[PDB]
Amino acid sequence: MDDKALLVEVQLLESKTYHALSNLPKARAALTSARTTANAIYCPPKLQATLD
Amino acid sequence: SYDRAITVFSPDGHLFQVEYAQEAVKKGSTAVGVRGRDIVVLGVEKKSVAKLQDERTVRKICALDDNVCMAFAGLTADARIVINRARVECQSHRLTVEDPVTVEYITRYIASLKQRYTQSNGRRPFGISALIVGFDFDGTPRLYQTDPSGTYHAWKANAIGRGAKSVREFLEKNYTDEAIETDDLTIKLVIKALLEVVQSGGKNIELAVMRRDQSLKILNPEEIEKYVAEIEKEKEENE
Amino acid sequence: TTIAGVVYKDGIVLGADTRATEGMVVADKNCSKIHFISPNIYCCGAGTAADTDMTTQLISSNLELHSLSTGRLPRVVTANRMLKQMLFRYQGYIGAALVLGGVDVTGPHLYSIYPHGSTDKLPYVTMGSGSLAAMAVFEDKFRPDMEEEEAKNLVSEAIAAGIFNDLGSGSNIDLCVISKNKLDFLRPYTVPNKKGTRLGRYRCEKGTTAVLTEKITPLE
Amino acid sequence: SSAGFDRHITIFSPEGRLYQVEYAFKAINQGGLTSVAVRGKDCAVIVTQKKVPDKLLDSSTVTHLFKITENIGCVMTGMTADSRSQVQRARYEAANWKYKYGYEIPVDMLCKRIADISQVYTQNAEMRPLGCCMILIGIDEEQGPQVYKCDPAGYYCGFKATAAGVKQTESTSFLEKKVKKKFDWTFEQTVETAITCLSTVLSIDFKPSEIEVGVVTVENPKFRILTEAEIDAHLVALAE
Amino acid sequence: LMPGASGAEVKGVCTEAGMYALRERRVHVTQEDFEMAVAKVMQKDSEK
Amino acid sequence: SRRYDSRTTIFSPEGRLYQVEYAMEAIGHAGTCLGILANDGVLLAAERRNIHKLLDEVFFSEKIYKLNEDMACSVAGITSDANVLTNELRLIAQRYLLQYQEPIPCEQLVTALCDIKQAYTQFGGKRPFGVSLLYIGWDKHYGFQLYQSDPSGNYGGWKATCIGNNSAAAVSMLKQDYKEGEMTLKSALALAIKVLNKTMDVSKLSAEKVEIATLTRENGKTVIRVLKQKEVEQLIKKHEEEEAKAEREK
Amino acid sequence: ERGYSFSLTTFSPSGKLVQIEYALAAVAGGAPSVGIKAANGVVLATEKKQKSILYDERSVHKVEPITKHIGLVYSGMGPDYRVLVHRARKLAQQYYLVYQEPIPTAQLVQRVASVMQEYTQSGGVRPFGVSLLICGWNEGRPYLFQSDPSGAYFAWKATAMGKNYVNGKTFLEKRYNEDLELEDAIHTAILTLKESFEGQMTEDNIEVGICNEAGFRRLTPTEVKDYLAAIA
């Protein structure tokens, strides 16, 4: 669908829950998808540092 | 109302739209028409068809009455509406005076229609010229021409279109009295003129005659190849 | 033909019959004669029915157009003005006896329109052929600022006078009540006269008629 | 930016603009005049100035206020020759409303019609599109007062405060600071705030002879023009 | 990941991917630098 | 005032005039249409220009307009100019039908329209139409017919003509592949798909990007079928099968 | 007096109608707006900012009803719009006085487009400089049409006009599908108006009118403030 911003939120939440449930390389992959996803959003106003 | 004088005089005394329109007449397909003593023979050259699709709609030889046939050159659009008005006018003559229309009278209608059309407002003049061939009452075959200024003008022979001055130079250098002895001999003179025209690879002619009593009659391209065959044969033995 | 209307204490009540009688022959039994003008203005027609129809389409088209331009509620004197301006121009050749009624911002307003252009505001009007009998009812039993049920009673009885006293009148009574906020158009208010039921069953069957040629063409 | 006769007639520029009307907006500014109209809670005030440079001239004939209808007043800026003709059009079409309809025309309807007429001149490429502006007031039922301004471009809008002319931008910059405090406005408050707009933007501190004020108020809906005596009363009322 | 920009955005991405490994102080350029770069250069494709 | 007049009526010093030739320059772009027949029926193929993914795809046709109950046209050029032309000759056919109570001869309809197009080219000081269109129809006198209008105001009889962006390139193959009277209205379909395969610079022949209408004579109907988008692509792949074996066999 | 009786628009040697080519730029400088039909009716959303606080936004309107079930908006200039608005208001009545029926939207567009092309050819006039968006739910199905100053028209599922429509239509291509509701088209219409709007989108920065099977109507800033509420 149309949105891009919530994709960063759900990839970040996956990166929370895989490492929080001890899945380090898949948490690295979901975090990486949050990086290359987050590369194109004009306004990450607080989700920038939340990702950081 | 679009009232605007278009035809204006030049500072040296000329009419620019007229002299430009005669150039547009001077690039159309060449038509040659001659008169006999009993049978007139006129025809167009440079059909320039696609030679695979329809051809009856591109006919440029009409009849205004039974005794008057008409050829032309120029742009095709302006001609046929003048033909339309000429048909209403010539039928209107029979609504008047009981006789069929004389070719002098209908050419005065054409030229007189054309001049005031050059005289009015907001109108470019016509871009056509015509050869009007008529066999009147008492069987006197004659023809005329029509300048884009609107001057009716009789002849013994005439030729207009693209490449017409050299064709007229052929017609003065070939028109005799004994050429109008036989009718097909005059037809051989016409095919001699179109052969003395330009290229015209065989299939590039549309002729039509009248025996001063019949309607117009167009030969299918078999007497074209036949008369061209005896013409090339006569020139072949003459050479 | 009998059309009538009245202004009660809050709104306007309109009533008519449903008869179109071609000469002395009953053509229609369900001829609606009350017509839309606006959501607050209706009209009742009389005389040449097609002239009333093509008039009332035109003017209500002009008020749909004009009110659609202004973006607000129309007024009764606007349609009154348009009609009395045009019928004077058509010089009485267009036959249309009209009852104009509507409740605008200023309130209820009623007019009677004559085909030459003369108009007037009155609290009650009767137009049509049997308008005399209904005018006798309104004159005998009129009272200002009556309630709407007394109005429906008086208008219904007034139409009923022309029903049982006029030759070219008498069918179901059409009514409409207009207030500042309520619009009640209703055709079958009452059935004063019915048809008797048939006694001899005259049913013919298939084959009692000689047919020369039959033709069938299928459809889809 | 320019191609062809777009500098001369009312057609479109290569930028999509058209230069003729925006040339005609500063034709109002060649008049050398600025008018202010302020709408009240139940009233509407029009104040403008006038410049009579000659004692040989009659100061009773320099009025830019015009009573269009019995309850409709307007003021004209721009040029006088186009303005008086526009006043003639407004009076005529208002009378035509009263004949076609039998009641009083609403002021937004009238200004809509005048804007429609002004659309035609810029809509064609033939006529000179009337380099003068238009300001009207009106008391309307279930709307109270309301103020409208029609430009020569055929645009119009309802205003709450109004300035037009030479000091128009600065006067509107004053009036937006006047209105952004959102004070409830009585009659003499709208008079005082109306005079202190041009009295401070123009900064004249004039005597009551060089201005004129038309007004309408819910009480008496007749548009009326003040006498210099009561103008002096509001002027010394302005001086505390 | 690149839907056909030109042959100049190829160098525009792949030269830029070394700035990611350098800004995180690598000595070997990794594959996620490139997908971290295509979404930036193609954001400039998404810019006017 | 006369300073502003552009004189759209006068001739050039070389004899011609420039206005309608600029219109005939504009007719080369923005459209691709062709007509073909040799037997019972006649086909018009029209290449659609608007291929954006948000279109309701309605109005029964795009460049096809039913004129009479037995004739129709495919149009090319300025669509807004064409809209007045379509309903313009449409009631000319209707006033023929009102005048004689008879369907109209297709040719003398085309002459009557081309007069009206010819008038603005002739006088009045008026911008002419940059519209050229084909003509399909049937009569009792000559059966199926095909005519071609020009923005100058002259017409012409044809059987198969494209006025596309690569129109003469199409005609170059039209006189390279044909047969007089025997190209039945499936062989001319498969030939037509080969033609628009060539002049369609966008390859792979999207079935939504084309419009093809047929005109057949049913006994009292003259069925002017407007083929759906479910039988286009089978003809597309039908061409695709024979072109691959035709290539590989050589 | 009289007119001019000569067309001021000619074909270029490149074959272009140059005043129409400039009038399209005049539309391109117009105010941004969008409209989306979604399975029950059409949502028309425009973007209207007053130049100062002195204006009454409740005085004029962009969303304009034409009849009971047809609404219309534009993207262009002001004074050209209201004229052809009034013309369409007439043309609905000349339909209705003949047919005793409201007009189909397509049958309205066939007349309005003919008015515009008839006007862009006639003598001594500049062509129009607005483009229109026309909505209507006739015979169940909604309809969404778009005109131009040249006099053509199109049937859009969703489109954008005004400023930055080349970005807004790419937003709609990534946004819309076939299965949405009217309130969904409201929400994504606010989502695409915020793409090119100013910093503050209040209840008066926009104006939205909608068609239903109940017909066309126009929103008030109460529920439009409810729509700007919980938006983005």
Side-chain angles (χ1 to χ4, degrees), chain A, chain B residues 1-25 27-38 40 42-44 50-134 136 138-139 141-155 157-161 163-164 166-168 170-172 174-179 183 185 187 189-190 193 199-202 204-205 208-210 213-214 216 218-221 223 227 229-230 237, chain C residues 1-8 10-179 181-205 207-213 215-220, chain D residues 1-40 43-50 52-54 56-58 60-141 143-176 178-181 185-191 193-218 220-240, chain E residues 1-35 37-47, chain F residues 1-11 13-35 37-49 52 54-175 177-182 184-192 194-199 201-203 205-208 210-220 222-227 231-248, chain G residues 1-15 17-33 35-49 54-57 59-136 140 142-160 162-173 177-181 183-190 192 195-196 199 201-223 226-227 229-230 232:
Chain A
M1 291 298 172
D2 181 75
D3 189 77
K4 185 63 70 177
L6 191 57
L7 281 77
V8 180
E9 193 272 332
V10 298
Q11 289 302 110
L12 184 62
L13 185 62
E14 288 176 354
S15 181
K16 295 176 69 66
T17 188
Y18 289 119
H19 179 72
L21 293 167
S22 180
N23 194 357
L24 194 278
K26 191 178 265 77
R28 180 66 58 84
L31 182 65
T32 306
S33 65
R35 295 292 298 274
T36 185
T37 303
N39 199 6
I41 287 94
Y42 183 73
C43 290
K46 184 257 181 65
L47 297 175
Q48 183 67 41
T50 307
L51 184 142
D52 288 330
Chain B
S1 67
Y2 183 69
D3 290 331
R4 182 177 177 86
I6 303 301
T7 300
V8 296
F9 289 95
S10 75
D12 55 354
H14 296 85
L15 298 179
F16 290 163
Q17 300 297 319
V18 175
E19 72 184 6
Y20 296 160
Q22 294 182 356
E23 296 175 352
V25 176
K27 64 183 181 180
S29 295
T30 301
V32 176
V34 301
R35 60 180 176 88
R37 65 188 180 276
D38 289 327
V40 292
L42 75 160
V44 300
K51 282 96 175 68
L52 46 35
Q53 291 172 1
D54 194 4
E55 71 274 14
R56 63 100 177 268
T57 62
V58 77
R59 294 179 183 177
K60 294 185 287 185
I61 298 97
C62 68
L64 297 174
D65 283 326
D66 52 354
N67 53 1
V68 176
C69 297
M70 179 179 174
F72 66 96
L75 64 95
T76 64
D78 289 333
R80 60 183 177 89
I81 51 97
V82 177
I83 296 169
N84 290 317
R85 298 177 64 86
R87 289 175 182 175
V88 178
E89 179 67 30
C90 73
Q91 197 63 254
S92 299
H93 188 198
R94 192 175 297 276
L95 192 145
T96 73
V97 192
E98 189 66 28
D99 58 349
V101 185
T102 66
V103 58
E104 193 271 335
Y105 179 75
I106 192 65
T107 50
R108 280 189 289 116
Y109 180 72
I110 294 167
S112 67
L113 186 144
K114 189 180 264 78
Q115 189 275 125
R116 60 177 298 277
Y117 179 77
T118 62
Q119 185 55 253
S120 176
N121 285 312
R123 294 178 178 180
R124 53 94 178 264
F126 294 119
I128 58 169
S129 294
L131 273 72
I132 299 97
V133 179
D136 56 355
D138 297 331
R142 67 177 63 88
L143 63 95
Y144 295 96
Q145 71 175 354
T146 299
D147 192 76
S149 66
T151 64
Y152 63 97
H153 186 74
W155 292 90
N158 212 175
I160 64 172
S166 66
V167 172
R168 186 178 296 110
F170 182 74
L171 290 174
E172 56 88 16
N174 205 3
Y175 182 77
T176 62
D177 195 4
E178 70 271 15
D183 292 332
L185 183 60
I187 297 168
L189 181 64
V190 174
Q199 191 34 114
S200 156
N204 251 327
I205 190 167
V209 298
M210 179 180 175
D213 293 326
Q214 297 299 110
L216 50 89
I218 295 98
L219 58 91
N220 53 359
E223 296 86 4
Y227 292 161
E230 68 182 2
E237 57 88 20
Chain C
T1 299
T2 300
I3 56 174
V6 73
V7 177
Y8 66 95
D10 293 328
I12 301 166
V13 175
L14 298 177
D17 57 347
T18 57
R19 286 186 67 186
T21 62
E22 181 67 29
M24 305 308 289
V25 177
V26 176
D28 193 2
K29 296 178 181 178
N30 199 359
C31 182
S32 178
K33 295 180 181 179
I34 300 171
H35 296 87
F36 181 81
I37 299 296
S38 79
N40 57 355
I41 300 168
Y42 285 173
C43 69
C44 294
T48 303
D51 287 336
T52 61
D53 289 331
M54 295 303 291
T55 303
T56 194
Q57 292 174 357
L58 178 61
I59 299 299
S60 181
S61 177
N62 295 316
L63 294 175
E64 182 180 2
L65 180 62
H66 177 70
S67 65
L68 182 54
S69 176
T70 60
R72 63 178 61 86
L73 190 68
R75 293 181 183 178
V76 183
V77 297
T78 300
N80 192 3
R81 179 62 59 86
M82 292 181 183
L83 288 173
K84 73 187 177 68
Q85 279 173 354
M86 64 177 290
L87 294 177
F88 179 75
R89 185 180 65 250
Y90 288 107
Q91 297 295 320
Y93 293 96
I94 295 172
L98 295 177
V99 175
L100 185 63
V103 179
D104 62 358
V105 180
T106 66
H109 296 288
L110 180 61
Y111 295 103
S112 67
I113 299 168
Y114 294 97
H116 296 285
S118 66
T119 61
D120 48 349
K121 184 186 286 184
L122 288 175
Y124 59 94
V125 289
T126 66
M127 297 301 291
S129 65
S131 64
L132 297 174
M135 185 64 75
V137 174
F138 283 169
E139 185 68 29
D140 186 74
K141 294 180 182 179
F142 182 74
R143 186 175 65 248
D145 289 330
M146 291 185 289
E147 292 296 324
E148 63 184 2
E149 296 296 323
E150 298 176 353
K152 290 171 72 174
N153 195 3
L154 184 63
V155 170
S156 64
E157 184 179 1
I159 296 297
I163 290 174
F164 296 100
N165 291 112
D166 185 74
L167 287 179
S169 296
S171 287
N172 295 319
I173 300 174
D174 301 341
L175 293 181
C176 183
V177 176
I178 306 171
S179 74
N181 51 1
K182 180 174 71 174
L183 180 60
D184 294 333
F185 180 74
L186 54 96
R187 299 183 71 189
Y189 181 73
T190 184
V191 182
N193 292 111
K194 290 175 68 177
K195 183 175 180 179
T197 62
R198 292 178 64 185
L199 279 75
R201 183 178 181 271
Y202 297 153
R203 174 70 268 167
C204 66
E205 293 294 324
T208 187
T209 304
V211 175
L212 297 176
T213 301
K215 287 178 69 176
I216 306 299
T217 300
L219 297 174
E220 70 271 14
Chain D
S1 296
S2 178
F5 295 104
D6 55 353
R7 298 290 179 180
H8 297 88
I9 60 172
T10 65
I11 59 170
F12 295 99
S13 75
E15 295 178 353
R17 294 179 182 271
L18 56 94
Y19 297 101
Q20 295 294 315
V21 174
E22 60 187 0
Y23 287 163
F25 282 166
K26 55 191 170 179
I28 291 96
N29 291 318
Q30 293 181 356
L33 188 64
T34 300
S35 65
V36 174
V38 175
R39 185 181 70 187
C43 63
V45 179
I46 298 173
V47 52
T48 188
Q49 66 181 357
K50 63 185 183 296
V52 180
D54 294 331
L56 296 174
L57 191 148
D58 194 2
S60 66
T61 60
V62 295
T63 305
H64 296 86
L65 295 169
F66 296 96
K67 183 179 179 180
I68 299 301
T69 324
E70 188 65 30
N71 297 320
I72 292 172
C74 76
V75 72
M76 305 306 293
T77 59
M79 64 185 73
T80 307
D82 293 338
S83 76
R84 188 176 177 90
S85 177
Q86 190 177 3
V87 171
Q88 182 61 256
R89 296 293 296 162
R91 294 177 184 268
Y92 182 67
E93 292 295 324
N96 295 318
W97 182 273
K98 187 61 183 293
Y99 184 71
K100 289 181 181 180
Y101 297 105
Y103 61 93
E104 184 67 29
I105 184 165
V107 60
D108 53 353
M109 296 299 108
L110 192 144
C111 185
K112 185 190 289 185
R113 293 292 299 274
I114 300 300
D116 291 330
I117 298 168
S118 296
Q119 199 284 136
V120 182
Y121 297 97
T122 181
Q123 184 53 253
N124 297 116
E126 182 181 1
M127 297 179 182
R128 184 178 64 85
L130 278 78
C132 68
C133 182
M134 190 78 209
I135 294 169
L136 292 90
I137 46 93
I139 299 299
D140 189 75
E141 291 84 4
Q143 293 297 321
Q146 53 185 356
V147 181
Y148 291 92
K149 180 185 286 185
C150 183
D151 60 359
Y155 179 77
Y156 67 100
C157 182
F159 290 170
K160 300 187 290 292
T162 300
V166 177
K167 303 299 291 296
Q168 180 175 1
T169 62
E170 295 85 3
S171 177
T172 53
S173 72
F174 182 74
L175 291 176
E176 62 185 0
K178 184 62 68 178
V179 73
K180 72 182 180 66
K181 66 183 180 181
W185 286 345
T186 69
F187 179 75
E188 290 84 4
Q189 288 175 355
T190 50
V191 172
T193 55
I195 297 169
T196 55
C197 181
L198 77 159
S199 297
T200 55
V201 173
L202 277 75
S203 70
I204 303 300
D205 297 332
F206 52 88
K207 66 185 180 294
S209 65
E210 289 87 4
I211 57 99
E212 63 185 4
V213 175
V215 75
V216 72
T217 307
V218 215
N220 190 1
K222 305 297 184 293
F223 175 72
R224 62 179 296 276
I225 300 169
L226 276 74
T227 312
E228 188 177 359
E230 64 186 359
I231 291 167
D232 198 5
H234 292 289
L235 186 62
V236 303
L238 190 146
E240 294 88 6
Chain E
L1 291 175
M2 294 182 288
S6 69
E9 289 84 4
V10 178
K11 67 182 292 293
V13 170
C14 184
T15 51
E16 198 272 332
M19 296 295 172
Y20 288 159
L22 191 142
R23 78 181 64 247
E24 66 186 357
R25 299 291 185 270
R26 293 184 183 271
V27 292
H28 293 90
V29 180
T30 58
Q31 63 181 358
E32 67 270 16
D33 297 330
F34 294 94
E35 65 186 1
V38 171
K40 188 177 77 173
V41 178
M42 278 61 253
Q43 190 270 331
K44 297 294 179 68
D45 194 5
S46 298
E47 192 272 330
Chain F
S1 178
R2 66 184 181 272
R3 183 178 63 247
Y4 297 99
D5 188 74
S6 65
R7 293 178 291 176
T8 63
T9 310
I10 65 170
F11 291 100
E14 58 185 356
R16 63 185 187 177
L17 71 98
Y18 291 157
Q19 188 67 253
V20 305
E21 293 179 352
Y22 291 165
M24 290 183 286
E25 193 274 334
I27 202 67
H29 295 88
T32 298
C33 295
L34 62 96
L37 77 158
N39 290 114
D40 47 353
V42 57
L43 61 93
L44 289 173
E47 182 178 2
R48 293 179 65 190
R49 182 67 66 193
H52 181 71
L54 297 175
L55 273 78
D56 295 332
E57 293 181 353
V58 289
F59 292 102
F60 179 76
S61 292
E62 181 68 29
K63 293 185 283 184
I64 310 299
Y65 294 98
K66 182 179 174 67
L67 303 178
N68 202 6
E69 291 90 8
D70 54 353
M71 74 191 70
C73 65
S74 178
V75 76
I78 296 97
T79 64
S80 67
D81 293 336
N83 294 123
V84 177
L85 299 173
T86 56
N87 57 6
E88 182 65 33
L89 89 163
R90 184 175 291 174
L91 86 158
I92 295 171
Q94 290 295 320
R95 73 179 67 252
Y96 187 85
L97 182 62
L98 187 66
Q99 182 180 2
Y100 292 161
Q101 301 295 114
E102 187 179 2
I104 186 167
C106 299
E107 183 177 1
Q108 73 178 0
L109 180 60
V110 171
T111 64
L113 181 61
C114 290
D115 295 330
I116 304 168
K117 190 186 286 186
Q118 190 270 332
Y120 290 164
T121 66
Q122 186 177 2
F123 66 99
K126 184 61 67 178
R127 179 183 62 82
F129 297 101
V131 174
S132 179
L133 72 155
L134 291 175
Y135 298 101
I136 60 167
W138 186 80
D139 61 348
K140 67 181 181 180
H141 295 284
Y142 297 99
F144 297 96
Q145 294 175 356
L146 196 281
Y147 293 101
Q148 181 183 5
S149 177
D150 295 330
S152 64
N154 52 357
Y155 63 94
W158 301 97
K159 295 180 179 66
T161 300
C162 182
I163 316 100
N165 51 1
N166 298 116
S167 65
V171 173
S172 66
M173 191 170 69
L174 286 175
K175 62 176 179 289
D177 194 3
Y178 62 99
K179 56 189 178 296
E180 293 87 358
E182 301 90 9
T184 65
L185 271 296
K186 296 179 292 297
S187 64
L189 295 175
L191 187 145
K194 183 174 69 67
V195 170
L196 59 92
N197 195 4
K198 182 61 65 66
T199 186
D201 294 332
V202 174
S203 296
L205 298 177
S206 297
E208 71 274 14
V210 294
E211 291 292 328
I212 293 94
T214 61
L215 186 148
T216 63
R217 176 58 183 161
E218 183 64 29
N219 303 117
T222 314
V223 173
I224 298 169
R225 213 272 316 297
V226 162
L227 59 108
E231 62 270 20
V232 180
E233 68 276 21
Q234 55 88 31
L235 184 60
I236 298 300
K237 62 97 179 177
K238 179 66 173 66
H239 180 74
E240 290 172 352
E241 294 294 327
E242 53 88 19
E243 69 187 359
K245 191 261 184 295
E247 190 272 331
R248 187 177 63 248
Chain G
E1 299 294 327
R2 58 104 177 86
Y4 275 160
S5 298
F6 63 95
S7 296
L8 52 87
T9 300
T10 64
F11 292 103
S12 66
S14 65
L17 296 175
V18 185
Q19 294 294 320
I20 298 171
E21 294 293 327
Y22 294 163
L24 291 174
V27 173
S33 178
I36 297 168
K37 63 183 294 295
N40 55 7
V42 190
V43 176
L44 291 182
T46 188
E47 193 271 333
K48 179 176 73 175
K49 287 178 70 67
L54 301 177
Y55 295 166
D56 191 4
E57 69 274 15
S59 66
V60 298
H61 298 284
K62 299 288 181 66
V63 170
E64 295 297 326
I66 308 299
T67 182
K68 178 65 177 65
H69 62 90
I70 293 169
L72 198 151
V73 296
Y74 72 102
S75 297
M77 67 183 72
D80 287 336
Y81 175 66
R82 296 177 291 113
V83 179
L84 51 90
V85 166
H86 177 75
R87 181 65 58 83
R89 296 288 182 85
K90 292 175 70 175
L91 288 176
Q93 301 299 320
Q94 289 102 31
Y95 188 84
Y96 184 75
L97 290 172
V98 176
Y99 295 103
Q100 295 303 111
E101 184 178 0
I103 193 168
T105 65
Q107 297 296 318
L108 184 61
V109 171
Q110 291 300 109
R111 297 181 181 179
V112 175
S114 68
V115 170
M116 300 184 78
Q117 188 269 332
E118 189 272 333
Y119 184 70
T120 193
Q121 191 177 2
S122 63
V125 289
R126 53 97 182 264
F128 291 114
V130 296
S131 292
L132 304 176
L133 295 175
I134 302 168
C135 65
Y143 296 103
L144 179 61
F145 291 153
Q146 181 179 3
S147 69
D148 57 355
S150 69
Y153 63 97
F154 295 99
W156 293 95
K157 297 182 182 295
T159 186
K163 288 176 68 176
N164 300 114
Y165 66 97
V166 296
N167 301 114
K169 289 175 71 175
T170 59
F171 184 79
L172 293 176
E173 193 273 333
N177 56 1
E178 295 295 326
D179 293 332
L180 292 173
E181 292 296 325
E183 71 275 15
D184 298 331
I186 288 168
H187 187 273
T188 186
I190 297 168
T192 187
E195 297 294 327
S196 297
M201 183 184 288
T202 62
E203 67 184 4
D204 53 353
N205 296 118
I206 51 96
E207 187 181 0
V208 178
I210 54 171
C211 280
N212 296 114
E213 193 64 28
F216 180 72
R217 64 179 295 273
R218 186 178 67 192
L219 293 177
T220 72
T222 301
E223 75 275 15
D226 298 332
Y227 289 153

